[PDB]
Curated annotation (Swiss-Prot):
Membrane topology: Peripheral membrane protein
PTM text: Phosphorylated by host on serines and threonines.
Superkingdom of this protein's organism: Viruses
Covered residues, full protein: 1334 to 1493 of 2474
Protein's job: Seems to be essential for minus-strand RNAs and subgenomic 26S mRNAs synthesis. Displays mono-ADP-ribosylhydrolase activity. ADP-ribosylation is a post-translational modification that controls various processes of the host cell and the virus probably needs to revert it for optimal viral replication. Binds proteins of G3BP family and sequesters them into the viral RNA replication complexes thereby inhibiting the formation of host stress granules on viral mRNAs.
Compartments (UniProt record): Host cytoplasmic vesicle membrane
Organism, scientific name: Chikungunya virus (strain S27-African prototype)
Coiled coil: none
Disulfide cysteine pairs (residue numbers): none
The name this protein goes by in its record: Non-structural protein 3
UniProt-reported outcome of changing residue 117 to V/W: Almost complete loss of mono-ADP-ribosylhydrolase activity
UniProt: ADP-D-ribose binding residues: 13, 27, 35, 115-117
Length: 163
């Protein structure tokens, strides 16, 4: 584990992360997709061999020795708010299990279901709180990646508020 497990946020491409493994914001079919998923496909395409997995689950595929944890958040276009919320929390709990199983000391993670799966809603707080629920009991250093300056500030504030 990390000597003093922390949360941090960076405003940059998660495909350029400085952590021991990455979480993909995957689609259920293991397709190259859009946004984070497409960046992950360009950087670690070998990790999309048999990466298909249902909504609410995580499946890790190694690119060389570098683990890519494919986490499938719900598309809120398809799900009700209530069921979407349930599957989003579940995806993060599976991420925590995989991070634990891999024995990594750090992980790069995007906010699941906040992009084209958001159903046109701002889900920063919803997604981040489910990330914290799952990851708080892990001892990996977590680095959250975002692209928007206002999101970086809001995520940073949320991390600092817990101390
Ligand atoms: Cl998304
Ligand atoms: Cl963002």
């Amino acid at each position: 584990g990390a000597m003093a497990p922390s949360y941090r946020v960076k405003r940059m491409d998660i495909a350029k992360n400085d952590e021991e493994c990455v979480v993909n914001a995957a689609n259920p079919r293991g397709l190259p997709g859009d946004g984070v998923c497409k960046a992950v496909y360009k950087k670690w395409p070998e990790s999309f061999k048999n990466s298909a997995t249902p909504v609410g689950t995580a499946k890790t595929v190694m690119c060389g020795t570098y683990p890519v944890i494919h986490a499938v958040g719900p598309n809120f276009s398809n799900y009700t708010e209530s069921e979407g919320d349930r599957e989003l929390a579940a995806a993060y709990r599976e991420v925590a299990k995989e991070v634990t199983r891999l024995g990594v000391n750090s992980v790069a993670i995007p906010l699941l279901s906040t992009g084209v799966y958001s159903g046109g809603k701002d889900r920063l707080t919803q997604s981040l709180n489910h990330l914290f629920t799952a990851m708080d009991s892990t001892d990996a250093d977590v680095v959250i990646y975002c692209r928007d300056k206002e999101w970086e500030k809001k995520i940073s504030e949320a991390i600092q508020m817990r101390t």
